[PDB]
């Protein structure tokens, strides 16, 4: 069975600090605060800080990532109507399937809009904003 | 524990009255269905505190009613008539699903796809949704 249905813990990383980097002579981009303007789509996948306020919180929902399922017939737990498993696939006579919430993964949801601060606007522009997930813990 | 306190109901009965020849003002309770409803359970973290964790596990709350909405009959057992030989059927809801005959019962009417659901003599439980503040 896969392994991120028992895995109990759940992973972060935390930028490099400035201090660190300027130790070692390399130019870190991950801590640098930026304001949602100067978020360009150039750095989509990159780790990136993000320096805003607050203004929208949504509460706490959950969010599933893997749908358990089970069948009578084989008994087979199938991970993603009919059983797929290799004993109902070479059978002639296939198990419908039944969803199980209790095997399914599921994980704690909130979203979060940030919003640039005044300093960061230039003159004749509206604060633009921009989307937070957060997931886990 | 509902089932087993069914039992125990069932078995109260059994053993505390008619085996004790106390009296026999049992004979019905063999057939209805009990259920018995924990509310005590200890003083609970509201609502704003709950977590995904917490999912199918018991808890408490308090709060105020808003919005409730009209007793909306929910289908339990479902009355199948065959549409050409007016054979009656009685299926039962097994988890929430009806399964529909696809040929009638009788051995001399096996026509397929010849049973009808009739709406009106069907048997329905009551369903309430609350909204609670
Ligand atoms: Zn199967
Ligand atoms: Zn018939």
Request: glycine share 4%.
């Given at each position: 069975?896969?392994?991120?249905?028992?895995?109990?813990?759940?992973?972060?990383?935390?930028?490099?600090?400035?201090?660190?980097?300027?130790?070692?002579?390399?130019?870190?981009?991950?801590?640098?605060?930026?304001?949602?303007?100067?978020?360009?789509?150039?750095?989509?996948?990159?780790?990136?800080?993000?320096?805003?306020?607050?203004?929208?919180?949504?509460?706490?929902?959950?969010?599933?990532?893997?749908?358990?399922?089970?069948?009578?017939?084989?008994?087979?737990?199938?991970?993603?109507?009919?059983?797929?498993?290799?004993?109902?696939?070479?059978?002639?006579?296939?198990?419908?399937?039944?969803?199980?919430?209790?095997?399914?993964?599921?994980?704690?949801?909130?979203?979060?809009?940030?919003?640039?601060?005044?300093?960061?606007?230039?003159?004749?522009?509206?604060?633009?904003?921009?989307?937070?997930?957060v997931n886990g813990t | 524990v509902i089932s087993i306190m069914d039992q125990t109901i069932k078995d109260c009965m059994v053993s505390l009255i008619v085996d004790n020849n106390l009296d026999y003002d049992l004979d019905e309770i063999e057939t209805k269905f009990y259920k018995v409803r924990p509310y005590n359970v200890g003083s609970c973290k509201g609502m704003r505190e709950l977590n995904p964790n917490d999912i199918d596990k018991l808890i408490n709350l308090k709060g105020l009613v808003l919005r409730s909405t009209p007793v909306i009959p929910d289908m339990k057992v479902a009355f199948f008539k065959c549409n050409v030989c007016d054979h009656t059927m009685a299926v039962e809801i097994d988890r929430g699903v009806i399964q529909e005959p696809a040929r009638c019962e009788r051995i001399d009417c096996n026509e397929p796809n010849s049973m009808s659901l009739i709406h009106n003599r069907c048997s329905f439980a009551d369903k309430q949704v609350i909204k609670l503040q």
């Open positions: 069975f896969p392994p991120n249905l028992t895995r109990r813990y759940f992973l972060y990383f935390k930028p490099l600090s400035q201090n660190c980097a300027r130790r070692y002579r390399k130019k870190a981009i991950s801590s640098k605060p930026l304001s949602v303007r100067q978020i360009k789509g150039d750095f989509l996948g990159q780790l990136i800080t993000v320096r805003g306020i607050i203004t929208r919180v949504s509460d706490v929902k959950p969010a599933v990532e893997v749908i358990a399922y089970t069948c009578d017939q084989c008994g087979y737990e199938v991970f993603q109507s009919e059983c797929t498993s290799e004993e109902c696939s070479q059978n002639q006579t296939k198990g419908q399937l039944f969803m199980s919430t209790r095997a399914s993964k599921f994980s704690a949801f909130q979203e979060c809009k940030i919003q640039e601060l005044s300093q960061q606007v230039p003159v004749g522009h509206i604060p633009r904003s921009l989307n937070i997930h | -």
